[PDB]
Amino acid sequence: PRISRHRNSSKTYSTPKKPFTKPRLDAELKLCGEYGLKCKREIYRARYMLAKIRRTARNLLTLDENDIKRRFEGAALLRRLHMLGILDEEKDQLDYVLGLRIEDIFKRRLQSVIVESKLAKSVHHARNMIKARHISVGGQIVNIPSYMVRISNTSRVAIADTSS
Amino acid sequence: MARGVRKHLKRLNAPKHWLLDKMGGIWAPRPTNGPHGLRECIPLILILRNRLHYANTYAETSMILQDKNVLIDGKPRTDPTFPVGFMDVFEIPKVHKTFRVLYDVKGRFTLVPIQSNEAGFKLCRVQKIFLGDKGMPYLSTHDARTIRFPHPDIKTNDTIKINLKTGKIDEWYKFDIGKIVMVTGGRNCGRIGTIQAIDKHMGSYTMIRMKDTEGTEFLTRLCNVFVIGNDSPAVAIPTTKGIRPDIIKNRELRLRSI
Amino acid sequence: MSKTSGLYTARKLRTVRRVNRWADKKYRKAHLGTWLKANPLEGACMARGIVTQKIGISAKQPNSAVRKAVRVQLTKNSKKITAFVPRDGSITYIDNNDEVLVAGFGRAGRAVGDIPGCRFKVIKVAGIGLLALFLRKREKRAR
Amino acid sequence: GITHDKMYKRSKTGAVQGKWHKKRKYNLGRQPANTKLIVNEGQKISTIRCRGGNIKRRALRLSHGSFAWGSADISHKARILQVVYNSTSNELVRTNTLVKGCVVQIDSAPFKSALSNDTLDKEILDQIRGDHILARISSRPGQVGTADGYILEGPELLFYQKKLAPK
RNA sequence: GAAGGGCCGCGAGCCCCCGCGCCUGGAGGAAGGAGAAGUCGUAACAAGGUAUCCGUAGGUGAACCUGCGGAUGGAUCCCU
RNA sequence: CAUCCGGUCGAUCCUGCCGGAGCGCGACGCUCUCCCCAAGGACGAAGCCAUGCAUGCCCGCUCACCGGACGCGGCGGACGGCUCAGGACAACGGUUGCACCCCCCGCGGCGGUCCUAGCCGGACACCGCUGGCAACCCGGCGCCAAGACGUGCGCGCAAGGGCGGGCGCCCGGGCGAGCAGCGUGACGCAGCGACGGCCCGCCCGGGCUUCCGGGGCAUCACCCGGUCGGCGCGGUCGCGGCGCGCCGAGGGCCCGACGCCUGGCGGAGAAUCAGGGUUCGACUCCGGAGAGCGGGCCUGCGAGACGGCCCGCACAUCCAAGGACGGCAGCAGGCGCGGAACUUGCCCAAUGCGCGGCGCGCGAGGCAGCGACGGGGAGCGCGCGAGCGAGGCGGGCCCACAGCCCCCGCCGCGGAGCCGAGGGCAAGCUGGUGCCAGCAGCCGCGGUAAUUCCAGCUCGGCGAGCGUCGCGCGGCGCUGCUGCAGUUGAAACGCCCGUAGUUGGCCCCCCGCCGCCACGAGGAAACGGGAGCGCUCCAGGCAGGCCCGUUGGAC
Ligand SMILES: [Mg+2]
Ligand SMILES: [Mg+2]
Ligand SMILES: [Mg+2]
Ligand SMILES: [Mg+2]
Ligand SMILES: [Mg+2]
Ligand SMILES: [Mg+2]
Ligand SMILES: [Mg+2]
Ligand SMILES: [Mg+2]
Ligand SMILES: [Mg+2]
Ligand SMILES: [Mg+2]
Ligand SMILES: [Mg+2]
Ligand SMILES: [Mg+2]
Ligand SMILES: [Mg+2]
Ligand SMILES: [Mg+2]
């Protein structure tokens, strides 16, 4: 057969079981306005990733502290979270993870990091600027609004040298 | 049921320890019959193309081999699918590179560079003694070689040193408690240790208990226990001495190399 | 207790469930086979047939109306069914001896609404969706 | 053709198994040789190409064989006269058909030409002074193309003598 | 050593008979369901105007009636 | 990632079902800006097939024409590719064995052959002359080659057969295991040898075989008669009722036989989602089976082979009417059928296979084309002025040739639909019609305000996607092991005895056995989980950096 048959693929998001729920609609619209999200698939993606992290943390927490698997997996998970900036550096216990929330994921988006740096007037302005390729990360132009910046690259985000 | 023997090999059906990319292609090389079997060998092209990188395609390897640029146990081989196995001698005079094919702790084939003094021989495991035509005693080994008129003092599962130039036995190591060994099959490929116990069950397998240098103990069946000397190895071994680190230490080493 | 609970009683429990799960109407209707042999569509989403008579059916007691339907004969079975074209003024687009595509209602095989003994819907005629003809997206000047 | 596959049989409960493939060449058989004693005519042996290129030879007609007297360690090639007893069936005897286990009469000349002068078993010597000696067949004609055997000795000889004497 | 012939073995196809499974016509007979604002009476719900019901047997245009035995889910938790 | 809501009444609490709300697989319908990945005549027609392609290569043998042709000879064509008809103690999955077996290439050994050897004999093919027939097909005569055929120079060597151990058992060639080999008395001269290979071992593969698992119906309760076992021969690569003769009578069954049915290929796995589970598994890897139906056979190590031959049956073709010829469930394409499914394209450059020394071939496979099955990423503006997209014209990079992505220059098409607005369930204003026309999954609306029909305004949900139909999971503690119910709602046999079956008080300090728990060996990946790595992110992939654990692909 064609080698293209062995290529993998998967979905990335989940839809709520009860759609018409007033508080949920209000909160989702509030978040969309605050962070200027395009559609409601982004929130579903964030919820999916958060659920994955929470499930991993639960499974690890069920075990004993001195379980080799627990140590290995918790160390990897904490390192990833710290490198990504989602979890604060000073927290190094698996319990703290279960308290995380999607807003922490959102705060690490490129729009957010360039807005808190005073490099853009607004999230909408940030998106428009990102599309036109006036921005760079570590000397490389990034035009994806949902691109997530690691902590080590936070000070390396600047305006594109070649942009007008 | 196929009406005859099999000539092809799907890539997904190839051995794991060959380390072949899923997207490389539909097919993988099918080794030809020779000194070693399909699951205890690795084709020459894989070594010459995907490791040493002296070639980038099948055709280049074909030219290199048909121009006589590699010697296996002192004999030039022109077959790209010739099987290479354990304790084989890989010499390339054009670049003065000499390697002995051994196992790493992870359980894969590795090339340990050697010297001139020890490249005139190899170690073989004797696993079968039988009478041939005219009642003449014989002896076979793991690399598909037979020797007539062996010494009566040589028994099964022993290890034999033979000169590459001449297939003549020099000295032999007995299978006994207290002898350094190397594991060549299963979950413990590449580990080195000393025999501590031997337990036999009538009509079934014989289990061998070995202890590593650090005090770790492990078990394996006698079918893949290889003697490599008398308390000290007879050949040069990889930089590591048959110590398998745990996942934690391997992760630390990876992070350090990052 | 009422149910057997011994450590070596798996066979009896399996047999009990095997026998007793045939008492559910849904499970029978699905796994018995009579419905499949009796359903004119043989487990298909929809079928293709020929209309042969255009008729109107009265509604039930608490309602008062005459619903517009047609009689159809399925090509692959040669049996007869009654299919109902709901959309307003869409009977005039259907002509006698015309090729149609007929699907089901919301419920699997029960009557829907006040229409008595009708279980099928017309969706395509002459190759054009009725919903599209009703909205004037396309025209049936080929017929 | 002829086959010995077990798919065409019944099960241990007496049930019909069913068939799931066509006939295969590994499971074939062949018509029997039915080797005949000679008593255009002569020794005729055929050859069969068997699986793996191996060669099998079945005898159709033959008249001689090698026979051994174990007690005295005497062995010669002798002519076979006729078949006189067979346990499987009397039809084979009537037709003088040679198979392993047949009881035959051989000519006595090669043995009497050197015997009747040394102390040995009385019965074999009494046979020797006559025209024929009772013997048995130990090879498989139809597989190796030969008919060899040995001269009967003690209790088995008594058994077969008591069997064929009334006839 | 060819054509050709004889006997056995593998075994197609056709004929005959038997059995199994799935569909199907049929005068007449008989059930059920739906539709309407049809004709004859009032069996049940109140002591429903003869308390109701169960089993069995017979009878009658129809619901039903009567005989033997039983129950209260009765209209009675109450009398030397 | 442990959720409920509307409907029996004049009102109320229950049982109990109907309906709604989510995910996935397909089909239908509306619509559609850009990029990346990607399935694609399987769904009671394993129905029928014009047209073209899908297996060749070459060492040996040149007085052929000017060595290339051609032919003999050798290797290969039994792999690969397609499909799931048939088959329900079978296939298949895990676990044993052959001390009952066969095996090409390849690797390593070994290599003694009874009774013209400066090199043996005769032919055929191609080719020349003469010819038949519509076609397909061949005939006769004639010089010539071999790593072709036959004969065969030589120190005895194939198959098979007879004899050769013990004294209760156990304590080398080799085993757990009297298995191998050898000697000796007779038979027989098989194979190798006109440029030396018979034979042995290993390897891959196959054949059978132990143990465990392996669909439904009891309106199928008894079934089998080479069926069960024993003796003997035959045949087979080989064990064996595998076949034949004789003897005896057995074997299986509620722990479900036998029979019947299946729109029945199996597994690795997929969908769904608290935990326990339910349903599916044509299709990527492994294994099996088949090539219109049913049978038979040659060549060969290997086929009961069908892009090999012979016959019967059902179809089909050409005929200058005597004869000849075929098998797409291989790639494209066509008819029929159906709700349902693409170009009669280019190339071996990559991965491999066959042959072979500086290479050929391969509809395997790769590249492109159609493609809203489907998955992933951006966008139809921000602001009081600037800026950037798509698109076009050119240059690079890439590519077997070309596109595509990406980079560089000059001009610069800014486009949203599908459903709904009484409740469940988020979202209301005029005009018509008048229980008609129509809506409505359920409750219900419509007999002059119609908050529900048809229109306009406005509003809501998702969004380049939205809606409708059918199926599966969930909802459902409405199949209940976890975990239902059984006075009155549906449901305790009229009662007793009783075999299979299920369940059985307390007690021994340690031994053996079964279950049980833990650890371990051994055994494919892919999928799933999971460590590390900025394909610009992502779906993905196993990469990659320079001053790399032996860079890595752990488990
Ligand atoms: Mg009354
Ligand atoms: Mg009354
Ligand atoms: Mg009453
Ligand atoms: Mg000779
Ligand atoms: Mg010759
Ligand atoms: Mg089938
Ligand atoms: Mg397959
Ligand atoms: Mg086949
Ligand atoms: Mg065939
Ligand atoms: Mg074909
Ligand atoms: Mg083929
Ligand atoms: Mg209930
Ligand atoms: Mg009642
Ligand atoms: Mg009741």
Coordinates of N, CA, C and O (backbone and C1' of nucleotides) and ligand atoms in Angstrom, one line a residue, chain F residues 120 148-152 194-195, ligand 5:
Chain F
rC120 P 38.8 -35.7 -28.8 O5' 37.8 -37.0 -28.5 C5' 38.4 -38.3 -28.5 C4' 37.3 -39.4 -28.5 C3' 36.1 -39.1 -29.3 O3' 36.2 -39.4 -30.7 C1' 35.4 -39.8 -27.1
rA148 P 27.4 -29.4 -20.0 O5' 26.2 -29.2 -21.1 C5' 25.0 -28.4 -20.7 C4' 23.9 -28.8 -21.6 C3' 23.6 -30.3 -21.7 O3' 22.8 -30.8 -20.6 C1' 23.6 -29.3 -23.9
rC149 P 23.2 -32.1 -19.9 O5' 23.0 -33.3 -21.0 C5' 21.6 -33.6 -21.4 C4' 21.6 -34.8 -22.4 C3' 22.4 -36.0 -22.0 O3' 21.7 -36.9 -21.1 C1' 22.9 -35.4 -24.3
rG150 P 22.5 -37.8 -20.1 O5' 23.2 -38.9 -21.1 C5' 22.4 -39.8 -21.9 C4' 23.3 -40.6 -22.8 C3' 24.4 -41.4 -22.1 O3' 24.1 -42.6 -21.5 C1' 25.2 -40.3 -24.1
rU151 P 24.9 -43.2 -20.3 O5' 26.3 -43.6 -21.0 C5' 26.5 -44.7 -21.8 C4' 27.9 -44.9 -22.3 C3' 29.0 -44.9 -21.3 O3' 29.2 -46.3 -20.8 C1' 29.5 -43.4 -23.0
rG152 P 29.4 -46.5 -19.2 O5' 30.9 -45.9 -19.0 C5' 32.0 -46.4 -19.7 C4' 33.1 -45.4 -19.8 C3' 33.8 -45.1 -18.4 O3' 34.8 -46.0 -18.1 C1' 33.3 -43.1 -19.6
rA194 P 33.3 -34.7 -16.5 O5' 34.4 -34.1 -17.5 C5' 35.1 -35.0 -18.3 C4' 35.9 -34.3 -19.4 C3' 35.0 -33.5 -20.4 O3' 35.7 -32.3 -20.8 C1' 36.2 -35.2 -21.6
rC195 P 35.2 -30.9 -20.4 O5' 35.6 -30.7 -18.9 C5' 36.9 -31.2 -18.4 C4' 37.6 -30.1 -17.7 C3' 37.1 -29.7 -16.4 O3' 37.4 -30.5 -15.3 C1' 37.7 -27.8 -17.7
Ligands
MG5 MG 29.3 -34.7 -19.9

